[PDB]
Amino acid sequence: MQQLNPSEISEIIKGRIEKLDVASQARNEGTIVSVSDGIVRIYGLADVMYGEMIEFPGGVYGMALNLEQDSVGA
Amino acid sequence: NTIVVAASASESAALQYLAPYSGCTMGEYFRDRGEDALIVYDDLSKQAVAYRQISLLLRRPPGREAYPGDVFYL
Amino acid sequence: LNPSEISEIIKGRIEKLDVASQARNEGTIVSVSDGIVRIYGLADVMYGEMIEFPGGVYGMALNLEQDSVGAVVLGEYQGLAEGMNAKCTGRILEVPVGPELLGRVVDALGNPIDGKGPIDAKATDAVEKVAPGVIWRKSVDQPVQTGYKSVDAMIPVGRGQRELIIGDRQIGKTALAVDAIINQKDSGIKCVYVAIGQKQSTIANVVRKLEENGALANTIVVAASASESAALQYLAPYSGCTMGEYFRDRGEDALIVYDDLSKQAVAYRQISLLLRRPPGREAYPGDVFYLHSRLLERASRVSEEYVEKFTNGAVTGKTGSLTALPIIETQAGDVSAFVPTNVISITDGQIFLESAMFNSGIRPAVNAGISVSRVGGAAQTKIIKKLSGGIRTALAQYRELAAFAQFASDLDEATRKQLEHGQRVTELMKQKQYAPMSIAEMSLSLYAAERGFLQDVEIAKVGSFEQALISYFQREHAALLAKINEKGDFNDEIDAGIKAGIEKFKATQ
Amino acid sequence: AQAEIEQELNSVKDALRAQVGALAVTGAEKILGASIDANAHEQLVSKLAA
Amino acid sequence: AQAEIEQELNSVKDALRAQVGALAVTGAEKILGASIDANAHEQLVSKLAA
Amino acid sequence: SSGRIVQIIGAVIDVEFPRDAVPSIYEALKVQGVETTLEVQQQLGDGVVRSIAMGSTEGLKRGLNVDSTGAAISVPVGKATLGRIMDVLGNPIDEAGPIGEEERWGIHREAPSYADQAGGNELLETGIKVIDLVCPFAKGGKVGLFGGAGVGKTVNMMELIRNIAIEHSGYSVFAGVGERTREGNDFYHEMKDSNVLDKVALVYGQMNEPPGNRLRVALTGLTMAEKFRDEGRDVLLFIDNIYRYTLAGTEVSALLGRMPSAVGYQPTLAEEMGVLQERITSTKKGSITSIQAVYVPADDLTDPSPATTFAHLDATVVLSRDIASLGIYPAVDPLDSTSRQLDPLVIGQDHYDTARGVQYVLQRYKELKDIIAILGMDELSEADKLLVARARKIQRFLSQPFFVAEVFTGSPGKYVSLKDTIAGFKGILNGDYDHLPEQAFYMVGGIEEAVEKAKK
Amino acid sequence: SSGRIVQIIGAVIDVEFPRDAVPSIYEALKVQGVETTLEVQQQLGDGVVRSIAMGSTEGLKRGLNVDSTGAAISVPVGKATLGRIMDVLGNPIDEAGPIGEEERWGIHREAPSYADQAGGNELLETGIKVIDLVCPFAKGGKVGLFGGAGVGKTVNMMELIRNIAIEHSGYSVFAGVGERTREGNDFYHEMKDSNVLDKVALVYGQMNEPPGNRLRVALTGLTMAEKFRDEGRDVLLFIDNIYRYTLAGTEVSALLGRMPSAVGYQPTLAEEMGVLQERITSTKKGSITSIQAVYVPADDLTDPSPATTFAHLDATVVLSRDIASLGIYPAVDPLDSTSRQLDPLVIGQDHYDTARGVQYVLQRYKELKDIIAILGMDELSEADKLLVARARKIQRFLSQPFFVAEVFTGSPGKYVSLKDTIAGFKGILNGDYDHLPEQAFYMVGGIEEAVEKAKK
Amino acid sequence: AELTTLARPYAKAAFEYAQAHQQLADWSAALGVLAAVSQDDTVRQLLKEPQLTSSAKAQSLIDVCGDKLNAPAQNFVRTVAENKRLELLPTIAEMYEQLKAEQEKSVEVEVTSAFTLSKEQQDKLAKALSARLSREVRLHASEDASLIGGVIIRAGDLVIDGSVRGKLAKLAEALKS
Ligand SMILES: Nc1ncnc2c1ncn2[C@@H]1O[C@H](COP(=O)(O)OP(=O)(O)OP(=O)(O)O)[C@@H](O)[C@H]1O
Numbered sequence A: 001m002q003q004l005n006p007s008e009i010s011e012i013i014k015g016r017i018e019k020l021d022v023a024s025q026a027r028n029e030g031t032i033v034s035v036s037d038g039i040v041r042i043y044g045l046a047d048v049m050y051g052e053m054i055e056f057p058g059g060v061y062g063m064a065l066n067l068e069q070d071s072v073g074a
Numbered sequence B: 001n002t003i004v005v006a007a008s009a010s011e012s013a014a015l016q017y018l019a020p021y022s023g024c025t026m027g028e029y030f031r032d033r034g035e036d037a038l039i040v041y042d043d044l045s046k047q048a049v050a051y052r053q054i055s056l057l058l059r060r061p062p063g064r065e066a067y068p069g070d071v072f073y074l
Numbered sequence C: 001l002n003p004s005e006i007s008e009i010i011k012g013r014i015e016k017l018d019v020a021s022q023a024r025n026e027g028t029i030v031s032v033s034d035g036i037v038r039i040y041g042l043a044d045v046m047y048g049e050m051i052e053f054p055g056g057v058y059g060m061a062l063n064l065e066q067d068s069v070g071a072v073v074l075g076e077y078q079g080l081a082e083g084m085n086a087k088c089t090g091r092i093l094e095v096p097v098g099p100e101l102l103g104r105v106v107d108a109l110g111n112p113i114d115g116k117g118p119i120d121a122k123a124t125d126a127v128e129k130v131a132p133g134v135i136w137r138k139s140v141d142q143p144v145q146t147g148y149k150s151v152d153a154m155i156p157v158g159r160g161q162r163e164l165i166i167g168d169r170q171i172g173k174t175a176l177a178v179d180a181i182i183n184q185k186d187s188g189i190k191c192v193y194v195a196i197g198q199k200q201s202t203i204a205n206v207v208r209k210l211e212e213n214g215a216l217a218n219t220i221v222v223a224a225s226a227s228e229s230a231a232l233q234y235l236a237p238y239s240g241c242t243m244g245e246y247f248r249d250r251g252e253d254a255l256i257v258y259d260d261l262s263k264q265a266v267a268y269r270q271i272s273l274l275l276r277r278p279p280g281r282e283a284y285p286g287d288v289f290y291l292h293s294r295l296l297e298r299a300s301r302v303s304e305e306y307v308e309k310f311t312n313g314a315v316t317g318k319t320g321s322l323t324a325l326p327i328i329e330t331q332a333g334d335v336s337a338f339v340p341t342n343v344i345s346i347t348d349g350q351i352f353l354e355s356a357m358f359n360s361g362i363r364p365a366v367n368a369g370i371s372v373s374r375v376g377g378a379a380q381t382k383i384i385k386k387l388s389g390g391i392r393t394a395l396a397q398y399r400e401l402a403a404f405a406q407f408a409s410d411l412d413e414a415t416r417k418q419l420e421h422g423q424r425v426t427e428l429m430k431q432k433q434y435a436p437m438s439i440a441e442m443s444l445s446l447y448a449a450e451r452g453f454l455q456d457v458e459i460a461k462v463g464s465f466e467q468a469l470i471s472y473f474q475r476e477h478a479a480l481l482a483k484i485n486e487k488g489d490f491n492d493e494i495d496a497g498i499k500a501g502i503e504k505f506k507a508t509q
Numbered sequence D, E: 001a002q003a004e005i006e007q008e009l010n011s012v013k014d015a016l017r018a019q020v021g022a023l024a025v026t027g028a029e030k031i032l033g034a035s036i037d038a039n040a041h042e043q044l045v046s047k048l049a050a
Numbered sequence F, G: 001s002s003g004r005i006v007q008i009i010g011a012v013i014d015v016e017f018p019r020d021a022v023p024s025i026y027e028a029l030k031v032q033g034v035e036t037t038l039e040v041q042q043q044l045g046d047g048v049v050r051s052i053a054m055g056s057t058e059g060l061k062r063g064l065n066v067d068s069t070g071a072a073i074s075v076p077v078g079k080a081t082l083g084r085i086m087d088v089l090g091n092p093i094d095e096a097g098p099i100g101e102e103e104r105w106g107i108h109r110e111a112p113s114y115a116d117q118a119g120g121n122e123l124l125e126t127g128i129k130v131i132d133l134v135c136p137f138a139k140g141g142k143v144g145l146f147g148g149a150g151v152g153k154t155v156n157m158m159e160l161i162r163n164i165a166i167e168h169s170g171y172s173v174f175a176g177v178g179e180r181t182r183e184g185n186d187f188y189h190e191m192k193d194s195n196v197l198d199k200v201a202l203v204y205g206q207m208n209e210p211p212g213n214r215l216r217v218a219l220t221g222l223t224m225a226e227k228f229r230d231e232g233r234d235v236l237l238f239i240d241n242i243y244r245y246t247l248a249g250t251e252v253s254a255l256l257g258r259m260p261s262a263v264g265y266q267p268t269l270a271e272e273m274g275v276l277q278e279r280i281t282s283t284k285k286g287s288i289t290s291i292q293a294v295y296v297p298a299d300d301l302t303d304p305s306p307a308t309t310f311a312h313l314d315a316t317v318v319l320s321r322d323i324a325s326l327g328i329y330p331a332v333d334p335l336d337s338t339s340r341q342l343d344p345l346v347i348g349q350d351h352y353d354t355a356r357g358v359q360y361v362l363q364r365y366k367e368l369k370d371i372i373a374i375l376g377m378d379e380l381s382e383a384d385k386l387l388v389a390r391a392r393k394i395q396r397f398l399s400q401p402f403f404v405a406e407v408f409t410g411s412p413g414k415y416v417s418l419k420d421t422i423a424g425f426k427g428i429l430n431g432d433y434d435h436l437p438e439q440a441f442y443m444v445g446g447i448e449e450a451v452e453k454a455k456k
Numbered sequence H: 001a002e003l004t005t006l007a008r009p010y011a012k013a014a015f016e017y018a019q020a021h022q023q024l025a026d027w028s029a030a031l032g033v034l035a036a037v038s039q040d041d042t043v044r045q046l047l048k049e050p051q052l053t054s055s056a057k058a059q060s061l062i063d064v065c066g067d068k069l070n071a072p073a074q075n076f077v078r079t080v081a082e083n084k085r086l087e088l089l090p091t092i093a094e095m096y097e098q099l100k101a102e103q104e105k106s107v108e109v110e111v112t113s114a115f116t117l118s119k120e121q122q123d124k125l126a127k128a129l130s131a132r133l134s135r136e137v138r139l140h141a142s143e144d145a146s147l148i149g150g151v152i153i154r155a156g157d158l159v160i161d162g163s164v165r166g167k168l169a170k171l172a173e174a175l176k177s
């Protein structure tokens, strides 16, 4: 049994119970799922390119480096 | 007076791993019938390298120099 | 011999037994592999708690995960199986403590293995504890006599010091530590001997030698042989330390020997690799320094305020102490290895035993060039402290000139006299096993060499001269030896008394 | 001393057979605070048959 | 030698107290004679004890 | 709103909080009944945070309630901390009652900016011949004492504390990080008996302590030194062992779910050093002069921890087991030791040429080691024989009896000025002492004492 | 109840059982309709157990039924095992029919307890002069045997097997750990031709067998030796190569996926050696003494395998190629061989002085031989020339005719008591036999026989 | 990983939605039927075929349940199938009941006795357990002739043993010492 992927969170799962539609969130936006050691894992952000700049609340900027199937590691 | 068994560098690692056993089997034909035979394995190190490749691709646990636990048994 | 009114004690057991029901917190074994067990349930289990399994087996909780508990088995794990019951005990890992352990041989959990019946200990204490802080300690200034001329003169040990014994295999490491325990039988210091990874036959021979020399009644023996579970080998030092701390906290003095801390490190590496923890240098765990440093920090001298606070005022105006003699084995004499270097960074000095000296017939084998005591100079007794200053330098002059003995008959007067004195001090420092010397006996040997009374004695007779001189003072000057043995004091009257006796000895015996 | 206890062991091993019944009955009335009246009637067969 | 003789005796006394005497755990046979009336008393006792 | 403990593995604890009340990184948490303090390190998602305990975890269980304090670990600062002993959390541990602080500061802070950096090369005399010669120190700079086990890092640091306190009138901070508890007691009573204690702030997190304490105690001591620096003072910061801060990170890294790097070290090794080391610096407001002992694992100077530390220091003093085995103390290696202050524009051409001349002779003697071991000195050229004799005198003249080491030998300590240091080595290099025996230079304070010792 | 094979990966087989019928660790399992036996190594949960096959897994398939035997691998024990060859499972591998055992014992058990230790240290008299004098064996001890090939290793084992059986009423067991089939066959015929086969039980774990077979053969031979010990006897256990036991553990540990230790050895290296070696001891009923051949990887005595093995050895016998060239048998080196019982407190002052006396003369002769070879015999003094004469007599008196070597030596075999051995060497050292020629001491049982041989 | 560690997010999401919309009863029936259906031997085999896409596995399971799944519960099955976790359904239902039981302040208790216990005795035990657990207890009585008398209670990891079998073991442990 694979370990729990980064997007298998109660809030992400509950959001899909109410609406399965992916387009209900703009492909230009996402939400922080985890913050560890300078690495942030995001759920969403479907139109992101490798190396593209991410704007976080507060003036902080990040960069996409791991465009995975369910999350984006920045 | 010689049987030549070949498993070249471009052949599948399975054939390179099996070639010594095939040649040994052809040599044993004479031993079991009351005759004498001589066999040359030009590189037992290359047979071990082929078996290590198969073992790592099959995800078997590695040991010293990345060889599998049964390399002595081989 | 066997009255029926004694075997009737069963009625007393039945009268004292309480059959009332009690709530237990439980779980079930899920998997079993190489001494590690996974358990489902046990919601009230604490980190470090003892877990109870059928057949009297115990485990220790080390992984409290959200959905399961990971435990290390404290003994033979092959009898455990999936579906067996596991119960919380409500107790952190503990062992029995007190004077009732003196003269007994026990396993790492405190169970008796000598066959002499149960242990009637009235108290227990936690195996894992943090050592007392900076303000609660006191400087080391009381001596611990090992009974060896070379060690007590050049590498003095004080009450509350940690002194490492280090060297290659089969060169007297055990002999030096066991002889130090034997010499404490009349000193008031209680002893603990912890055998980690040793052969059962070796442990049995050490216990036989402790009773043949009258030291067993003053010693607690903790054993974790070469075939016992790695969990018990890793835990044995902390059990022995806890039994030794019982005396320290109550304003008394104790001595502990860890027969092989390098075997404890090998046992901890096994558990860590079986738990798949990432290894470092020489494949040891990242916390291998914390393993020994946490153990050796407990050996200390605690102040009167600590003893008064700990005993709730029952013991007043007395300091308490725990002295430690850890042992380390080095491969091919290499002191630069990872585990030896870690323990040198923890202890207050070390005694290095040299393989070349041991094979050359110098059995004590103490390498004076590198051996040193960081806090023993303040602890050494007045007589030995004043006479030992010239011993250390004389051996240095010998090490620098020893190879020249084949041509030294053709050298300058100064170098010839320095070499001739170094040879006599080297010969004098030899001593047999199980033959400890008192302060007065060591003082005669040191005085004869420091004051030049050996210059006209040939090397082949320095040992004969020493045994004859000590025997002579024992009959002609018994009152002077009795005076020196009280507290090792050295006044003008004692100095005059010793030279008068040695001069009469040289002139008549 | 080993020979002295061998002799005695045999005597006392037979003496103990008279006590196991009272020990077992004390155990039965310890488990539950009742039936001490009923146990006295079955005791005669039970002591031996246990 | 005298301490070793006392250790032998106490090992025999304990082995007798463990082999024989402890045989009284056969008090289960006495207890096997219990019925529904006694069970009700044990359920009340258990209930009073949570 | 409080959270609950969901997992416990060694020093690392996972706590679950409501999605709208998750604590920030570095925030301090407290277990309700036990009062154990935890520092948040990572946000795992779904309301769970991973933290390190600032104390023993024995006896803790799953399901215990945890309160968040709303801020990072904060410690007392200023004049109230002088002459007192504190733990990692800032509690008094000297039994002398509560601390009277006017304010508390969080232990996590950003390093001073590029524009705040102070430039300076003012020479600091140590009174130690080898240090004043080949690796001179500067006021407001950083010094590292590199060495294996038992070679002398503490004895040398205690002699430097004794000698630098002669010309320094300001405050001092001593941080005991992962070292012997006995050494802390010895130093405390020595300063208390000498009446020097009221000028020093003491912070201790020794070997007996859990991983969380040994990982943050260096920040607590540094936070006190930063208050004095920012008040416009000149302060001395001594660190008992900087390697222990790195090792505590290695002990906990696997539990934090990180992949191991070379030789099992944490992947964040260089960043963990940089975040600490950049704060230990002098600024336009005030200065921090710092001396740090650096442990070397298994005597290997190429090990990732010592190797990453060299780049953070102004002066590097390397101690050697080979030199210590010959009975030469302080045991500094003159070929491996170095300082940025060894510049003609800072120390002048006379000192610079003398230090260069000493290194040239010692390097040439080192190259002859194998030839001398197999064939002896007699097969060398007349020029090599003269150089070997001077190299042997230079090695012995670098030795010095220390005041703190008087207990180990009874020999009185010696203080040597830079003037006397340069004059002695220059005379030996020029051949003014070619007639003296090499044993005359061993354990002599000044060149005059070598001349007197040669007459015996 | 039976289980089913659920997974097969080389020699590792996973079997699924009903939740209430899961087999115990080390329990032996039988595959239905095939002769394959499996040993349970780990319990994975959900009723699944991981096991190692005791033979080839070729032709096995998922879903085959597996039966639990209720106990560990059980082997035949007692007199019925003498003169027969068996595999790891105790099956006869010779064509001599079924073994007539009356009892079977499981191969796994705890070592004798602290209270079972025999106590006093007693010597095992081998009847061989060089061994009994220079490297005495203690009852219940472990002896390391070193040397090359073609130096008399088999002949020494056959002589020890003869002497324990005929002179001490004991028995022998041979455990062929990683045995070569050609050499195993040759050894069986050499023992039959030497009439020693009926005095020893043979267990072979051949090189072509899976890792589990090679690992367990030592325990099978040891279990057979434990039965003979409990009959009130002194037993000899021969282990063909203790290094191959260590390697079989490394192979099995790698198959089971355990994380490797330093130098790639299994993490359980010291514990696996301890479990084997701690059963070989002297108990209150009888004793098992063991002779083990030792291989040193890359000639490195500090390698984990030799270093872990040496902690358990009580004596070391070194066979020499040079001594065999001189026609001296057995070819044992009196200067390289060692013994922990060669101590005056263990063997007494008379035996110790005699043994040390022989070693001193032989050591000094080794040095004088180099002087004679480089400068000539005329450089030596009359005292040195007398010492050379005594050294030659001592060196020849160490030689001995063996009952199993009568084919090679022609002369009848001799058993020499320890009393006769000490008296003979003491007399030669004291010069009591200086009038006899050196050739009189070659191939003679005792000093008396040398006096009689000198008249011919 | 433990099946419980993987089913926790899904069980928690289904419980929060069911609670927020007052559908706690409906989801207990939906999850229960999905759990039972996913374990039948033809469905157990269909949910392991290599040619079916995640959407076809979800649709097949939705068509079998039919009317026993509201629109939200169908979105949940499609989510569990898309994330490749349809083997967790029995554990998701089990964990959903634990969250629901603690929300309703109820506890499930297992009881074993030597002989059948009457309703008066069951209520007498339930009363005491409810008082210490401060929850609405639901007893599940059962028979076990292994005990020679008394009862054994178990509520989660709490175990209260009042059986004479346990008392006979304590007596043995106290005499074997
Ligand atoms: N002072 C001594 N005089 C004579 N012999 C000694 C002396 N000290 C030790 N020995 C002898 O040295 C040998 C080895 O000693 P010991 O067993 O203590 O060494 P060790 O290093 O502890 O061995 P090990 O590594 O096996 O534990 C023994 O024969 C012992 O009797």
Ligand SMILES: Nc1ncnc2c1ncn2[C@@H]1O[C@H](COP(=O)(O)OP(=O)(O)O)[C@@H](O)[C@H]1O
Pocket: C345, C372, C374, F147, F148, F149, F150, F151, F152, F153, F154, F155, F156, F179, F240, F241, F293, F329, F330, F402, F405, F408
């Ligand atoms: N001048 C000196 N004389 C004697 N010993 C010295 C001298 N300098 C250093 N040492 C040695 O230094 C050691 C202490 O330093 P070290 O162990 O490196 O420091 P730390 O206490 O930080 O571990 C002691 O063994 C001490 O004997």
Ligand SMILES: Nc1ncnc2c1ncn2[C@@H]1O[C@H](COP(=O)(O)OP(=O)(O)O)[C@@H](O)[C@H]1O
Pocket: G148, G149, G150, G151, G152, G153, G154, G155, G156, G329, G330, G402, G405, G408, G409
């Ligand atoms: N006692 C002996 N007397 C004479 N020759 C011997 C003796 N011991 C060994 N040899 C010679 O050494 C040869 C090889 O001995 P062996 O025990 O088989 O050594 P290995 O097994 O190492 O090959 C024998 O065949 C014999 O020729």
Ligand SMILES: [Mg+2]
Pocket: C173, C174, C259
């Ligand atoms: Mg030892």
